[PDB]
Write a protein that binds this ligand. Structure first.
Ligand code: HEM
Ligand code: HEM
Ligand SMILES: Cc1cc(N)nc2cc(-c3ccc(CCN)cc3)ccc12
Ligand SMILES: Cc1cc(N)nc2cc(-c3ccc(CCN)cc3)ccc12
Ligand SMILES: C[C@H](O)[C@H](O)[C@H]1CNc2nc(N)[nH]c(=O)c2N1
Ligand SMILES: C[C@H](O)[C@H](O)[C@H]1CNc2nc(N)[nH]c(=O)c2N1
Ligand SMILES: [Zn+2]
Lengths: 415, 410
């Protein structure tokens, strides 16, 4: 690799210089001859002593460099203490300061996230003292209450104990803390959210009694210390929701749509200094298109384009009439209107992409770069009238990071 | 190794073997992806292997691999690279190579049409006047009174690089852009530089909003020369709206024929620096990018005004609403004047069908997701949810420097 890589914005002509890519840590999947950039994903295999040493040192060095104490006595002592501990226990524990730094930087490093202008403002909840699923339930409830804040949403992460031997993992089996159930019908239709059919079925087998409605908040399915997972009902008063209405179309409310206020993804893995936090639910606030375009208008999701287009009395026989495009806009108008009216934090795709460009420029200037995944950063509607469409980006993997992990029901050893 | 791509909407999985045949670079490395970079950065010796690979796949394509005709062609080519430091393609080869450069064009969503391409051999051309004649014939043919037909015209290949044939226009038909004294821009801002260069070369500009630019044509490395495309050859569409009667009062129009003229065609190591090619428009090319880019005609505000939308906050999505209406009008207007055009929904379905065809008969299809997904309503088109593998196959179309940056005037 060369020392300097340049990116260009084809709308503004601004050119930025990236040097941070030199700290790249893992493979992208791309090679010299193929690009895997549109590929979505390109047990007791735990880190050996030898594999762990340099990964720990790398992180510790980076941490002390960030607090302007690189090469200090405290730095050297921390290094030695981490080494001793890896040597005698085959693992090590992070200091609270290091945990907070690591969590914030995994967000900062998350190439697919358009919301990272916010990265340094993250409430970190240290849950490494947790031992049971009931305890996990307590921590998650507190997280949800704090992050929701009566609609004035605050970004937050709760971190449970790291992996040891791979047979004692903490996991949240939910993909997000709050999601709606989906039920496959005998006739092939789906009630509720089709995205969540598999996990809904799992909950039902585990003993969940389903209301069988369109917007049933799923139970938490929580695994502590590698034991079998356990079911819990989130208190309904902790689940903030927004009825979707349209500022012009009075009939829009009659669709009976609502969505939940807090996006809180719970199936990802947090890696810091070679340590693996398999349960680390984190939450921010929504970009409207996430609900209005994907959740509602994806064919294999709620798929309401048809019903909305009908109520708008559009010609639905020619694709070239753009009836889908027109309905898509009104739905996203309704979603933003309904959240803003109920004073629940939400950001539109124009504002968010504009902030991200400012953020990326600042990062290039003060950090020497900003990894970014164009395929994910550009919003799912109106792509080219947002500033990120014309922005060249470089994608690469920095650590600490958030990673994908297999679904736990595919790996769990039932006791 | 074999690679899988998955559609997340339909769960269809395809297997790519075709990528194993590429040897050009993508720009990425194992540690940095450059997927969204627009332009990631011969001799006797270099030429023959390249010529060999091309002939090999041509004779393999007509199922005569290793035939007497095949063997003799290789030898004929080798002798010719020896005695002339280059070689000339057979007509069949020229046609095969042009079609395959299109088939291999990872950024083009229109490739289901790839084998329907009229190839015009212009390799006997020697002067800018001759270039003009060939290009007029191309435009007349491709336009076909609204029933557009894909075509490419191929001018003489690069020799020593001092005698290049170049079309200086980025497209055969484009509108002038003029840098206004008060600061703003009249016409198309994408073309301001080229427009100035035409004026500087003697073109008398009407200084309207839709002035068709003259052709600026360079033959054998000589100074370029100006030509006016006969107006009756330039098909245009007045843009109106099926419900908003005021839309026509905006005075907008566009041309029916998209004909990119500034790329390079490479076939078996040979380089064709002048190779204008044309198809027909996808509506968003005009209605999203050409009209609504900030640095293009930038008409969202005017439209949104006439629609009486709340433009005080972004979250009204007034830009999004105006965007859809403009693209409705563009499609409606071409369709009403019976000029070939495809909407982004129909175009992307066809591309998904094309991908399936190509994976079946060819073992893959190189595709650039960043360019294939339309600039509006992305995820409600089927390509958004389609994993793609991008890789570079030859014959191909490549970018080249703008000629005014290199040309030593005379
Ligand atoms: C605070 C406001 C935030 C906004 C507006 C925001 C916005 C987004 C959006 C729109 C996406 C794409 C999601 C999708 O299409 O499904 C995304 C992805 C992502 N975000 Fe953020 N986000 C925010 C907060 C956070 C926080 C607090 C974290 C972690 C601490 C985070 C980490 C991530 C990660 C790892 C992804 C990629 C998910 C994946 O690949 O599956 N974001 N974000
Ligand atoms: C027949 C109808 C066709 C349609 C509907 C179509 C559609 C498109 C569209 C929408 C783009 C994106 C252009 C942009 O965003 O600037 C594109 C790019 C491209 N097309 Fe096609 N196309 C067609 C025919 C052709 C033909 C005949 C050729 C060559 C023989 C071709 C070669 C290319 C190439 C090389 C690019 C990428 C150029 C670049 O990298 O800037 N296309 N096409
Ligand atoms: C922290 C945060 C905030 C936000 N507004 N959206 C997120 C969206 C995700 C996300 C949601 C769903 C998926 C599944 C594929 N779309 C992948 C990632 C994760 C975290 C988010
Ligand atoms: C052959 C063909 C057909 C079509 N409908 N659009 C094209 C559009 C292009 C094209 C147009 C503009 C640009 C510059 C960046 N938008 C790059 C490529 C090239 C060829 C096209
Ligand atoms: C195939 C493609 O990679 C996949 O559909 C991606 C594309 N970009 C995306 N971008 C975001 N923000 N979210 C997504 O789910 C996706 N899906
Ligand atoms: C930065 C980015 O690569 C650039 O804006 C690209 C993005 N995708 C595109 N896709 C198409 N079809 N046409 C374009 O001009 C572009 N521009
Ligand atoms: Zn890549």
């Amino acid at each position: 690799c060369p020392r300097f890589l340049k990116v260009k914005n084809w709308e503004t002509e601004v050119v930025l210089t990236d040097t941070l890519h030199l700290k790249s840590t893992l493979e992208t999947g791309c090679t010299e001859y193929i690009c895997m950039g549109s590929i979505m994903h390109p047990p007791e295999d735990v880190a050996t002593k030898d594999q762990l040493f340099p990964l720990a040192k790398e992180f510790i060095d980076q941490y002390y460099s960030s607090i302007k104490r690189f090469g200090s006595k405290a730095h050297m002592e921390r290094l030695e203490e981490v080494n001793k501990e890896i040597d005698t226990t085959s693992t090590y524990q992070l200091k609270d300061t290091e945990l907070i730094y690591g969590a914030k930087h995994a967000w900062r490093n998350a190439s697919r996230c358009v919301g990272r202008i916010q990265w340094s403002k993250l409430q970190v909840f240290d849950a490494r003292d947790c031992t049971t699923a009931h305890g996990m339930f307590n921590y998650i409830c507190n997280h949800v209450k704090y992050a929701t804040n009566k609609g004035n949403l605050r970004s937050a992460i709760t971190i449970f104990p790291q992996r040891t031997d791979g047979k004692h993992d903490f996991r949240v089996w939910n993909s997000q803390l709050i999601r709606y159930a989906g039920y496959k019908q005998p006739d092939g239709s789906t009630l509720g959210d089709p995205a969540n059919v598999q996990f809904t079925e799992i909950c039902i087998q585990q003993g969940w009694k389903p209301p069988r409605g369109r917007f049933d908040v799923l139970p938490l399915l929580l695994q502590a210390n590698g034991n079998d997972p356990e079911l819990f009902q989130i208190p309904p008063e902790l689940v903030l929701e927004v009825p979707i209405r349209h500022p012009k179309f009075e009939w829009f409310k009659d669709l009976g749509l609502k969505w939940y206020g807090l996006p809180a993804v719970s199936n990802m893995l947090l890696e810091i200094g070679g340590l693996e936090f398999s349960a680390c639910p984190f939450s921010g606030w929504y970009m409207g298109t996430e609900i209005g375009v994907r959740d509602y208008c994806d064919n294999s999701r709620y798929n309401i384009l048809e019903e909305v287009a009908k109520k708008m009395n559009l010609d639905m026989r020619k694709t070239s009439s753009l009836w889908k495009d027109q309905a898509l806009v009104e739905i996203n108008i309704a979603v933003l209107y309904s959240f803003q009216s109920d004073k629940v934090t939400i950001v539109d795709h124009h504002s968010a992409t504009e902030s991200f460009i400012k953020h990326m420029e600042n990062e290039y200037r003060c950090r020497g770069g900003c990894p970014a995944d164009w395929v994910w950063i550009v919003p799912p509607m109106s792509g080219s009238i947002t500033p990120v469409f014309h922005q060249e980006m470089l994608n690469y993997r920095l650590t600490p990071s958030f990673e994908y992990q297999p679904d736990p029901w595919n790996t769990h050893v039932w006791k």
